[PDB]
Amino acid sequence: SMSVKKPKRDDSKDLALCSMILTEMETHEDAWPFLLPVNLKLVPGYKKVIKKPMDFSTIREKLSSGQYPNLETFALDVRLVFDNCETFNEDDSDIGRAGHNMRKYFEKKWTDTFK
């Protein structure tokens, strides 16, 4: 509370580390469904069903232009990509399995980097 603070964690490398983790996700071979925004004009249903589209290139833009106030807001956008994937795709499909793989891949990098 006021004048009562926990020891300060050094957060000065967070931006560069998040950028590094995003790059590792983008080079994963199962990243292809997530690299660019879904085409809202060519994919029936997606615009109406998915209230908040997110993808790796949009995350890169936000990251590089200072639009994440902290670590956690970056993580939320990354998870949003995979939650959207799960909402719109059957588990038993290539894209469905891609999403599962990428989420697990991310959460490991995340844990290994910060926790």
Ligand X SMILES: O=C(O)c1cccc(C(=O)O)n1
Q: List residues binding ligand X (CB under 6 A).
A: 40-41, 47-48
Find the shortest distance in angstroms from Cβ 39 to ligand X.
8
Q: What is the DSSP string of 69-100?
A: SSHHHHHHHHHHHHHHHHHHS-SSSHHHHHHH
- Using DSSP's 3-state secondary structure scheme, residue 48 falls into helix
The residue (of 88 and 105) whose beta carbon lies closer to ligand X is: 88
Minimum distance of ligand X from residue 55's CB (angstroms): 14
Residue 48 or 115 with smaller CB distance to ligand X: 48
Give the CA radius of gyration of the chain: 16
Tell me the closest approach of the beta carbon of residue 52 to ligand X, in angstroms.
13
